[PDB]
Amino acid sequence: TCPFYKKIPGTGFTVDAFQYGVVEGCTAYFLTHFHSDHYAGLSKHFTFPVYCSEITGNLLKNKLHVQEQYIHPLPLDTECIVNGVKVVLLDANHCPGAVMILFYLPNGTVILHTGDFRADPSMERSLLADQKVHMLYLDTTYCSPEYTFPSQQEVIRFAINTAFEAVTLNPHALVVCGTYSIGKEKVFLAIADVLGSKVGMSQEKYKTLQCLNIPEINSLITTDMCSSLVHLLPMMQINFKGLQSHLKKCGGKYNQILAFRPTGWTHSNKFTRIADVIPQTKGNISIYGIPYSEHSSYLEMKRFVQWLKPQKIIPTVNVGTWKSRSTMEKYFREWKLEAGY
């Protein structure tokens, strides 16, 4: 059945709750972003109001074939009324089109649902600064102190410098980047830019990227693999067998692959700096795992919450085990006692 942490009290609303059938009493279904664990259930047969960003609405129409009459896109940073309740959508610093949702309840309670997010100090100067938030529905993906990672900017610097050096030493090397969802576009787009290439990809992935309102996209991507030296493949194909196979398909145009896997966290982070990352190599294939995260580190999450000072926190991630739930509740109490709220 629909879990309580997907329901917004005092409303008829749910958040990211499309795989439970008709949720009894739900008058509006919000979708925070286009990732499969969150949209699971949606299709052309859905006949209830879906409330989302413009970009998520493009993807629903084009990829899932949801009918237009049931897609209700909202502008960001704008007070809107939905079934008699004031709401605002905020940028979540996740993947393209991802939002947080502020609900202003008729009784005066204010609720923030972060969806999936990477907390950032820039959020401290949005419409969130303007009133108190009582309840926070929190993306707790990496809510443990072991989870450190570098800035996205540091990671992209490493990737750009590594790719440019490789291809300049060997003009016959091919760069490959893995993907299995929207997000993390900066990785392959930044590398393509430094090399003076477009990124080549399948027709399905090109279609998906053409829904994202990214500026000058027609200048950065292509379905013509022959004209491109940065290729995108399914994440599943980023291994030695899958890459050897891909290299055969390129007909002796290339004699080396440098591949990138933009993972979330991996336990090389507890020890190793970005400067010190090394690839796994077999023959003329090298694979780099790089820690490009679109979720908050522990310290970023902690700073956001200690700034916001919510009265109650409802975790939305890692809620399935008692040991996880209890650990998270201990951190929330530490944060509250350190900061004084």
Ligand code: NI
């Ligand atoms: Ni997500």
